[PDB]
């Protein structure tokens, strides 16, 4: 119905600019404002700026020197810019739409921005099989940056037995891990493969979980 | 900017329990007042506004009261898919401002943790690295503490440890712990132990194998 789209993951290097691109569906910005807030490990959630009706906009007084907001209405767009990020800038950054006011009914799903001048890398992606009732498998994407990787197994098809464990940062390189859990009788017989895709590389690999 | 304050950072509450959550604004918002639930995965939904006024599609056991400064969501009967952050926010004066949130967590019987432990890839090996990886999955509750010992002597060097939030369907916990070492380093020892200290056992629960 209502649906808020937001444009998607952004490494900015400091003392670059940031921009968000927000896209609406089922109802126009004619008839709706748009509201962004967002949230940091340092301050909570923290509302930025409006873009109302007519065009004009409100500005967070802490954020009017290096903040931006426009639209276009015949696209149903609209558009947040920030100048001279900072690290203390990474967070996850939300349009949403007021009903009315400060009331804001529906959010996008959030844009996180990392603000660092870490190298992108990829990944490395290994196979943990078990050591040689249930049997649990396991993949380790390791040495990455910058966040996300999306990991599957069997492509999206082995889901309820997963269990996918937030990245973990050191030294600018992240690492992740997943495991999947089955009955013991259904593998190795049948086949299980850890699918990792990590975008801001162009890296895209499948790893087998082979017996030792 | 008035500073919006939640009472208490996170809650533990049972299935069916009435379930409240309070905010204090440091100054009279005239029930301009509102309540968003987040999400693990960043979505956020309007719950209550205006103090008391259910949002759309919203379930019924979602109320709210307050006046003045102060205010409180109320969860009639907490179900299964209440675990979220709560967030109050005001509107009354610009900024709109937002409380700290409220984490909202399931509490329910002991789970002992599925513990795996995966020793290094084949070929993380032939590259000259060495991860050992321990899962501990589907446990309750979330307090749990993992020793990594090689030949017996706890190793506190380089260890990465990443829980899940709680599950969605059955309120367990995961976590993820990673003892990353040189190749040449897990060569010199043989045995590798995932040690972990729960509710759910007296002793430490010991995972281990001997590079063989
Ligand atoms: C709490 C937080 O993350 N925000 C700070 C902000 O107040 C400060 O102006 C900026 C430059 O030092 O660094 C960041």
């Known amino acids: 119905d209502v649906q808020l789209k937001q444009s998607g993951p952004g490494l900015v290097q400091p003392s670059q600019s940031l921009s968000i691109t927000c896209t609406v569906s089922?109802?126009?910005?004619?008839?709706?404002?748009v509201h962004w807030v967002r949230q940091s490990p340092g301050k909570g959630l923290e509302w930025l700026g409006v873009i109302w009706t007519g065009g004009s906009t409100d500005y967070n007084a802490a954020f009017i020197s290096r903040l931006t907001i426009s639209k276009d209405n015949s696209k149903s767009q609209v558009f947040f810019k920030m100048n001279s990020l900072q690290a203390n800038d990474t967070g996850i950054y939300y349009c949403?739409?007021?009903?009315?006011?400060?009331?804001?009914?529906?959010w996008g799903q959030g844009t996180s921005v990392t603000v660092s001048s870490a190298k992108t890398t990829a990944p490395s992606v290994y196979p943990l099989a078990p050591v040689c009732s249930s049997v649990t498998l396991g993949c380790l994407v390791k040495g990455y940056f910058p966040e996300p990787v999306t990991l599957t197994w069997n492509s999206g098809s082995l889901s309820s037995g997963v269990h996918t464990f937030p990245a973990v940062l050191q030294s600018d390189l992240y690492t992740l891990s997943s495991s999947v859990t089955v009955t013991s009788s259904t593998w190795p017989s049948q086949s299980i493969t850890c699918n990792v895709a990590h975008p801001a590389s162009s890296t895209k690999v499948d790893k087998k979980i082979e017996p030792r | 900017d008035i500073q919006m304050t939640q009472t208490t950072s996170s809650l533990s509450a049972s299935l069916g329990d009435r379930v409240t959550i309070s905010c204090r604004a440091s100054?009279?918002?005239?029930?301009?007042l509102n309540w968003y639930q987040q999400k693990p995965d960043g979505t956020v939904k309007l719950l209550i506004y205006?103090?008391?006024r259910l949002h759309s599609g919203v379930p019924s056991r979602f109320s709210g009261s307050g006046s003045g400064t102060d205010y409180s969501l109320t969860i009639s009967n907490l179900e299964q898919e209440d675990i979220a952050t709560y967030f109050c926010q005001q509107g009354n004066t610009f900024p709109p401002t937002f409380g700290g949130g409220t984490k909202l967590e399931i509490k329910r019987a002991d789970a002992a943790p599925t513990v795996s432990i995966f020793p290094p890839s084949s070929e993380q090996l032939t590259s000259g690295g060495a991860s050992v990886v321990c899962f501990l999955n589907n446990f309750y509750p979330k307090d749990i503490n993992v020793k990594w010992k090689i030949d017996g002597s706890e190793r506190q060097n380089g260890v990465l440890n990443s829980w899940t939030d709680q599950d969605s369907k059955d309120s367990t916990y995961s976590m993820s712990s990673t003892l990353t070492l040189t190749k040449d380093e897990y060569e010199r020892h043989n045995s590798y132990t995932c040690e972990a200290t729960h509710k759910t056992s007296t002793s430490p629960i010991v995972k281990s194998f001997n590079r063989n």
């Open positions: 205006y103090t008391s």
């Open positions: 949403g739409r007021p009903y009315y006011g400060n009331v804001m009914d529906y």
């Open positions: 100054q009279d918002i005239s029930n301009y």
């Open positions: 089922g109802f126009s910005l004619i008839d709706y404002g």
